[PDB]
Amino acid sequence: PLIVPYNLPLPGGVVPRMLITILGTVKPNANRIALDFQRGNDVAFHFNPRFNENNRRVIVCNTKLDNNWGREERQSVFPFESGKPFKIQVLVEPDHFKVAVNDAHLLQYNHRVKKLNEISKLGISGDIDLTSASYTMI
Numbered sequence: 001p002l003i004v005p006y007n008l009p010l011p012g013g014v015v016p017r018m019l020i021t022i023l024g025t026v027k028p029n030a031n032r033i034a035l036d037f038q039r040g041n042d043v044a045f046h047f048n049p050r051f052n053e054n055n056r057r058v059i060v061c062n063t064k065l066d067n068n069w070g071r072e073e074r075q076s077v078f079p080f081e082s083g084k085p086f087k088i089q090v091l092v093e094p095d096h097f098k099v100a101v102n103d104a105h106l107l108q109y110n111h112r113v114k115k116l117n118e119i120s121k122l123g124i125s126g127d128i129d130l131t132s133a134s135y136t137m138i
């Protein structure tokens with residue numbers, strides 16, 4: 001079991017073909033989950049399931065530059081379930097992060113932060129029990 005919030009260093013930054021896998025279980029009555037791929041203080045890719053935003057479940061994605069959030073990209077397909085185990089896979093492709101949950105494609109997020117090799121840590125936070133956080137090359 002891993003302590004949340006959890007920092008996963010990404011040595012040498014991300015690169016196309018890098019696959020990050022997060023395994024955990026959503027807490028009962030969860031409100032949020034967040035993955036934050038960081039370039040220093042900037043957040044290149046924030047992936048933020050929200051379980052009750054005005055009585056809707058939505059995934060909010062964004063980038064934070066110089067402490068300012070940009071334009072949100074919202075996905076209404078919501079594969080997380082309170083109380084249940086999940087797998088998030090984030091595949092770095094040349095032009096986007098590609099995210100699958102429980103082996104099903106969920107969304108893509110076009111690279112706004114383009115210095116991929118400088119995106120050198122992943123923060124994992126929110127209302128989960130974190131089981132595993134790892135990476136490999138495919």
Ligand SMILES: OC[C@@H](O)[C@@H](O[C@@H]1O[C@H](CO)[C@H](O)[C@H](O)[C@H]1O)[C@H](O)[C@@H](O)CO
Nearest residue numbers: 046048060061062063069070071072073
């Ligand atoms: O509610 C405050 C507002 O800035 C938005 O919430 C922020 O959204 C970020 C991503 O865009 C982060 O998730 C941050 O943690 C969160 O506070 C909010 O999403 C509004 O834009 C809704 O209209």
